[PDB]
Every structure is written in structure tokens, then in C-alpha cells.
Symmetry: C3
Subunit: 374 residues, 3 copies
């Protein structure tokens, strides 16, 4: 009856068949994270699986399962995958590579689950009465209900929309909001203070067709211009006065005729005359005519003498008066004053003068006559 102590040391090639009970394997080959203490330094890992909250892990204060893959030996270069132990589902990866693989140089852990990314699924649907100032973390959310935007706080407008947040830094937080009608608003939380929502102009809130182009600002295009304009002070030439008759109040004649002009200023026409020895003078205002004339007779023989004298011109209507006097042509014997005259008759053409003497001597007398008529 052979005992184990009777069996010599064997090479692994002696197991020619069968499958080992998994209890014969080191724990790390069974998926058990129990090979090393649960605070082991993953930087100095030599086992392919551990569970540790060591600070060289990816998240301070948290446990992670850490798988390790090694080359050229378990002290050399390595790749590590860390997966969370509790609280959340997270994965990270890192690597150590060095020319001397034992002098490990670990790169930073890199996140391997989309929990650190902008995801194709939305981060959430926002309810009513929410203050958008609290959305200080990167992501994108839906506001499905305009009333819920209106019922909230710090929405740019009371409309359903899409909120996108970029948290670049605690002091630089950018938010964008796009309404269900396509309008964009943007604001930033700069150094802890939210700046005003900036509103883009779009074809839903501005129409330049309602506003006047500079090219349309012209006199020709101005509507409502009156036909005539109050004139400022200006002068004129008489040639520009084209109708009417200027009255006496304005220094005018009050009429457009010579006779009417004289009548309105009380002026009279000039006189006409023939300045001859047998001449005349006419006042055309009244039509009165005054003529004078003289005739040479000679001696008065005695008794009574009648003579007809013809006026320089005929009186149009009548002779009103005659004034006969005696002229001395010569003084042969006595003066012509010894002859006296008187008018016998008058007509429009002339008169008849009678003469007589009171000395029976010779004379050379003439008859002067002045007449008045119209």
C-alpha cells in the first residue's frame, strides 16, 4: 500500500489526462482577487489580479479590481485594467514601459467607460421648477415642456429646448440653450458669477425688411412731401408781376389806361397852343380856347365902319366873349386912339367890329381882337 511519502518528485508531464480541480490553481487564476492584501501597491504588482484601494489606483479612496499583464516577467513592463468594486460601474486602463522594464514608469490611468464622455443618450429630462444655475457639470439635458421652462429659474426663455453644458473649469462653465423653434442662447459662469444669457438674432426675432436701408434714405423716396412749400424771403423783378392792376394804396395808378390813371391821381392833360400873332391857346382840361388877332385897316373915312375879322381857328361850339381894341399902324395926321370900336356880332369863325372916330382927320389904325370860347 503506497503512501504519498513513497512517491518521488514528479514532472508536470506525468499528468497525462484529466482536468485539474480548480482548487489546485493559484487564486488569481480562479478569478479570486485574494492573492495579495487588499491595500497592495498596484505599481509593484506581480500577480495578474488583485483588489486594492491603494492610492496608486485610479480613484482616491476607492477599491478597484486590477488585472495585470506582464512582459518580459512579472517585474517588468505591464498593462493594467481597473474595474470598480462598488458604488458605480467604471473601468480604467494604464501602462508601464521603460527601457529597463524593472524601473517602472507608469502612465496615468485612462477612463474606459462612457461615464466620462458626452454620451449619445441624454443625461436627463428636466422637470418643472428647476434652476438652471445648478447645471454646472458637462453634459446635455432635455427640457420637454415650455411650461416647465417658464416654471423654472434662469432659463433664457419659457420654451422647451435643449441644454448643453461645458464645464471647462470651476471658473469657466459654458451653457447653451436651443429652443424647439431653433433659437440659440448662450451664457457663461465666469469666476463664479453667471453672465447674462446672450440672445442670437434669427429669422424668428428680427426681420431687416422692416427697417430702412441707407440706399432708401433719399428725398425722392420720402413719402408725405407736400406739393408746395412756405417760401422764405425773396425778391422779384417787375417782369414777374403778370396779372392784376396795382392800386394807389401800393403806389400804383389804380387803372390800366392813361385817362383812368390821371383820374385816380387827379392829373390834367397838357395844353395846346399856336404861338403866333394870330394865334390861340387851348386848355384841353376844359376845352376852352383863347385866340388873339390883329388886322390893318388904315384911315377911318367917317361915319360908321363895319369889318369882319376871322378867328385863327373856328370855335368847335361857340364864341363866349370878344375884347376889341384899337391898334395904331401909323400916325399920318392924328392918332388911332381917335378911333374907337365895339363888337356887332360873333360866330364860331369870326366876328364883326364896328368903328367910329371923333376927329375928322386921317389915321392908320388897326383892330385888335381877343376871343374866348369852346
Amino acid at each position: 500500500a503506497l503512501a504519498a511519502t513513497d512517491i518521488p518528485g514528479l514532472d508536470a508531464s506525468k499528468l497525462v489526462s484529466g482536468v485539474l480541480a480548480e482548487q489546485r490553481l493559484p487564486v488569481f487564476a480562479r478569478g479570486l482577487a485574494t492573492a495579495v492584501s487588499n491595500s497592495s501597491d498596484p505599481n509593484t504588482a506581480t500577480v495578474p489580479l488583485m483588489l486594492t484601494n491603494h492610492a496608486n489606483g485610479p480613484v482616491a479612496g476607492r477599491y478597484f479590481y486590477i488585472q495585470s499583464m506582464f512582459y518580459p516577467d512579472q517585474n517588468g513592463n505591464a498593462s493594467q485594467i481597473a474595474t470598480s468594486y462598488n458604488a458605480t460601474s467604471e473601468m480604467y486602463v494604464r501602462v508601464s514601459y521603460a527601457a529597463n522594464p524593472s524601473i517602472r514608469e507608469w502612465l496615468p490611468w485612462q477612463r474606459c467607460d462612457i461615464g466620462g464622455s458626452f454620451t449619445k443618450t441624454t443625461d436627463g429630462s428636466i422637470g418643472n421648477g428647476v434652476n438652471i444655475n445648478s447645471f454646472v457639470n458637462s453634459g446635455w439635458w432635455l427640457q420637454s415642456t415650455s411650461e416647465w421652462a417658464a416654471g423654472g429659474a434662469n432659463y433664457p426663455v419659457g420654451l422647451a429646448g435643449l441644454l448643453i453644458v461645458y464645464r471647462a473649469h470651476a471658473d469657466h462653465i459654458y451653457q447653451t440653450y436651443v429652443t424647439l423653434n431653433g433659437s440659440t442662447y448662450s451664457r457663461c459662469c465666469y469666476a463664479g458669477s453667471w453672465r447674462p444669457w446672450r440672445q442670437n438674432w434669427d429669422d424668428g426675432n428680427f426681420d431687416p425688411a422692416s427697417y430702412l436701408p441707407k440706399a432708401g434714405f433719399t428725398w425722392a423716396a420720402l413719402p408725405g412731401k407736400p406739393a408746395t412749400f412756405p417760401p422764405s424771403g425773396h425778391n422779384h423783378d417787375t417782369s414777374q408781376i403778370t396779372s392784376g392792376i396795382l392800386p394807389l394804396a401800393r403806389g400804383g395808378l389804380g387803372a390800366n389806361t392813361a385817362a383812368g390813371a390821371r383820374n385816380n391821381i387827379g392829373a390834367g392833360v397838357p395844353a395846346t397852343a399856336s404861338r403866333a400873332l394870330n394865334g390861340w391857346w387851348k386848355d384841353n382840361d376844359t376845352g376852352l380856347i383863347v385866340q388873339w388877332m390883329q388886322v390893318n385897316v388904315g384911315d377911318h373915312p367917317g361915319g360908321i365902319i363895319d369889318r369882319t375879322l376871322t378867328f385863327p381857328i373856328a370855335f368847335p361850339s361857340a364864341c363866349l366873349h370878344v375884347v376889341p381894341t384899337v391898334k395904331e399902324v401909323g400916325r399920318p395926321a392924328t392918332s388911332a386912339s381917335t378911333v374907337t370900336v365895339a363888337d356887332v356880332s360873333v360866330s364860331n369863325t369870326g366876328c364883326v367890329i364896328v368903328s367910329s372916330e371923333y376927329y375928322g382927320l386921317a389915321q392908320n389904325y388897326g383892330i385888335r381882337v381877343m376871343a374866348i370860347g369852346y
Copy 2:
């Protein structure tokens, strides 16, 4: 010769050398996902590797390889990594933790491959003839060609650009389009109905410098104004009539001189006169002068008496007529009618009058003379 049945049970320490043939290993330590049935529940996993389409996997109806890492034993807390079996290359991670690790509390699967996120590579390049209404899934796509945007359907404009899509919910899908020239449009599919593209105003489609500011709207700034304006009804003062000579047809004199005025209205100048006993009267229209005068002589002694009379003023040209008569200054003895007269000669300065009597008593006569000339 010994048979295997003669050999007792051996401890693992009996293998002192060599590398086990991998066929001796539990299948999971060889990478074989054959340890359990392919519908096993990963929630109850006790093996480090399985392949299962059980509902508790990450994607309904699909097979996944699921790795499990356990602590403190294979019935306790666990971390799981699921990788796809076919169709796509996907990875998920989850975890179970509990105070009593045997009473597992699984968290939801978290996706690891970037297929679930907005990726730094584009989701694709859009060809010609595509209807953008069909892009209802989150992502971003490239339209490389303006002609293909024009040849498609429901692009905001026929220009190459970038399309970004946010499927926030089946009834809330947001699209943004940025053209190659920087112009942004936005629209939303609300409850399955696409709303109109909203077009932002930018310096590519709007120039405020082309529109008139209110501050530039003034009379002084209005271009195209006329130099003069058609006047409306107004009045004037004579002082504004500054040039020209008003014609008779309008009530004017038709001349700028007093002589020309009289000539144009047919008016004559006024007469002058010296209204004295020995006086004169002149018609300045014709120049005719009439004079009258008297002198006291006294008694007529007899015979023929000559006396010279000097006109008040001298006739400038010639005397045309004289009218002598007799005046009675007094009647000391007899009346002056007994004396008669006649004119002998006449000059420009006066005349000579001859007198005779027919009664021989003492008279006191004078001589009156009236003269006409020019």
C-alpha cells in the same frame, strides 16, 4: 508494474518541475468560455469566464463573453466585463457589492466602447440625394459637397456643412447645421414632426451698416434735396420788388423819370403865376405868358399923348398881343371914359400906348394893359 490505481492521492507540491499541458487546466484558465451553459445567469456567476445570452447580460437577445472577478469568494462581490460575441465590437462593465457579499446587488451595465458616445471621428460622410429628416439618432455627420446638399432633401441650404444631432427623446430630436462658410441653422423634430429650420442672422446675411440709424434720420442728412422748392401762396411788400420798371398794363408808369411818367400817362406840368396887381401867369405846358398892369396918369391935356408901360416881367421871346383900356383913378372934374387909347408899339419889355380925349375938363385916368406872349 505499477498501475495508476496503486498511486495514492497526491498534493500539488508533488509536481516539482515542468509546465503543465494546458489541457490539464480548467477551461476558463485557457480562455475557453465553455465552463457553463450558454444561457447561464451572469448574476449568479461563480466562474471567471462564461458565454451567455441570458437576459441579465448587457444587450437583450445577444450573446456576450462575460469575465468575472470575485471577492472574497466566488459567491461574493464581483466585477464583470462583457464583450460581444458577434455582429458588433462592444464592451460593458458592471459590479455587485453588498454588506453580505453573498446577497448580491448588481448595478446596471455601463457601456465601455466609444460607440455609445459622441466620438472624435465623424459618424459618416453623407452622399447625394439624402433626406436629412431621417437623421434621428445622436451623432454628427459630414456633408462634404454643396451640390449634394442641394441634391438632397431638408438641408437648410444647398451648402456643404456639418450636421449635429441630439436624440434627447423619441419626441425631442434636435439638429444643428453649420455651413462651410460659418452660418448656423437649427431645428427640432417635435413629436415626430420636423419644425422649420431657424436661420441665425450673421455677418454673411445681414449688414447693419447698410441700414439707417435713427440718429442719421434728419433733414440735414437727407440726400437729394432740391436747391429750390415750388412756393405756396404768399404775399409781398413793394420793397421786395427790387428791379424792373412796372408797366402800365399792371398799374405802373412804364418809366423811371418824372418826365417819362407824365409822357406815358399824358399829363401836363403845373402853371406858375405872380398874383399881384401888376402880375403875370405862365402856362409851362406851352410857355405862354399872360401879364396885366396899370399906371396912374391923371388929366389928359389934349392933342396926342404917348406913354411907355413896362411889363412886370420881360417876355423871353416876343409879345404876341396887347389889350389896353382906360382906368378912372378919381373924378376930380370928369370921368376917365372921356379918354381913349390904342397901342403904338410893343417890345419884349413893354409897350407904348397913345391916348386922346373928347372932353376938355380935368380927368384922373390911368392905363390898364394886358399882354400875351412867350
Copy 3:
């Protein structure tokens, strides 16, 4: 003493206790990536762990640890997880599946680390002096400092902001810049050439209230309109001349009264007259009045006869001259020339004429008188 060579081939079930020293395990079960050459093709992987830079790995030229999980055997279908060996921390996954699992059909490698995604942490903060043309890779970056944007190159504006980049393709790169005040600019590098930044109009750079609506472009609304306007040429009627007195220089009377007018043109007033046998004539220029009259007497009874004659009108001031002559009414016995006359006295209303005869016969004479005065 039993020799190992005397021990028969054993089944794995002979190992009833203990844990194998890990040196007994195939290397891949120890986390060692040394089972195959480090250029082995992962498409033909039959071991669960290798390290290779073969072209069929995820990133050309780079080494990756490649884990494999197999079904139904190590030649069949497989899932593979690749993790980086150096330089960066990266993870990838792929799969092979086919109806005949041993004739593999590999799907493309899919990335798992968030390095391939838009992440919820920014890609970096930009310093001063940076040219944004170099940002040709997808991501989002922070410009914290307006001075650093001004001090850089190819920023749209010298303001702090957020830079978002979409590298769709080497020929299609889109950039968006959102300033800390909420203003958005966009540009595109198209086929290797950057195009100008496009500036959106928003309420921070454009206020329509400053610009004039078309509705406000009206004559009534235009400010600064003058009260009066320079008139163009026009004509007038005399009635529009409502004040002033036209002077002689312009063809006017220089006066608004008849008398004044006459004086300014040097004109005289009309004469008046009573054209009767006992009539008168008046020169209203000088006021001189000339009268003529006649009275029939009959016979002269001898002696001295005085007779009063009354002037047709009274001289307003004085009678300056009378001219008496003798008229013949008839010739009964001798002529009226045998009667002579002379004036005795004169008044404003009449005169006294004395008469005598040098015959002693019957006459029928009258007295004519012409008078001058004012």
C-alpha cells in the same frame, strides 16, 4: 525507492490537495505575455494572452497586449481586448464569428478608452501666443483669458471663450468659438484652406431699436425741417402785393395819395370852368381865375353913367385886373362905338364901369368886362 520513471501516467484527479506553484502553469495563466513571439498574428490567436505589434492589431506600428476569449475551442470564435504597451494608455475590442468558427471573420477593432470621444473634461486650457489654426483635431478647449486670445493668432475676437473643433476629415475641419459673453463665431477649414470666421449677430453686438423702421421714414417724422424754403421761380398778381409803396425807381408813384403822386411826377391838376356867356375859367394849379361877362344897357342919355357889374363868381381873395369894352346890341340911330367906358372901382364880387358918349344920338350898347383874380 520508487523512481519517477516507475510511476505510470496519472490523471489530473490524482492531485487531491494543495495549490500548484505558479511555475507549473502555462505562462499566459500567470499574466505573462510570453507564450508566443511578439510579432504573432492575433487573427490566428490560440492563446488567451499575447504581446504583439502585428499589423492586425489595433494601431499600426504599436505593441498591444491582446487577451483572447474563445468558443467553442481555441481555434473558433473569439473576443479580443487589446491594451497598449507604451506611449499612451489605450484599449480596444474586436470579435470573430462565423458559422464555421474555425474559419474566422474578424470585425474591426473598436476603441474603448475615452481618448476617442468628446469627454466631459476639457481637452486643455490654451495659453498666450497660440495660433488656433493648429487646432485641427476634434475636441474642446478653454481660453480663460481675453488677453491671451488677443495675444494669439486666428481667434475670432480678443476675448476669453470656448473653442470646439470637429475634425470630420483632413479636408473638413469645423471650429466654433463661444466667448465668455455668449457670442458665437464659426469657421471651417475646407480642403486645407481656412475660411473666414463667421460672426453671429446677437443682442450684445446689434440693437434694432437704434435703427429706423420703414414705418418711421416719413416727412412728418423727419426732424430738422425748416419753417420756410428757398423758393423757385414764380409769378405774382398785384393783389399779392399787400404792403408798401412802389417807388419811382421801379415805375411807381412813390406815394399813396393823389397829391403826393402828382408831386413826385411833377404833374399839375386839371382846370375848371363855366363855359357860359357870363362864365369863368380857373387854373387850379395857381388858383388864378379868369371871368368874362356882358350886360345890355341900351341908349346912353348923355352925361356920366356909372354901372355896377357882378362877376359870374366871386373872387375868393381879390380881383387883380378888369378889361371893359363896349358891345353893340343894336344900331337904332348910331353905332355903339360912339360910347366909351372905363373902370371906376373893383371888388371881389364885381366892378363899377363909367360910360360916356361923343355923339349925342341914340345907341343900343352894352358893356363887356373880362376880369382876372384869385
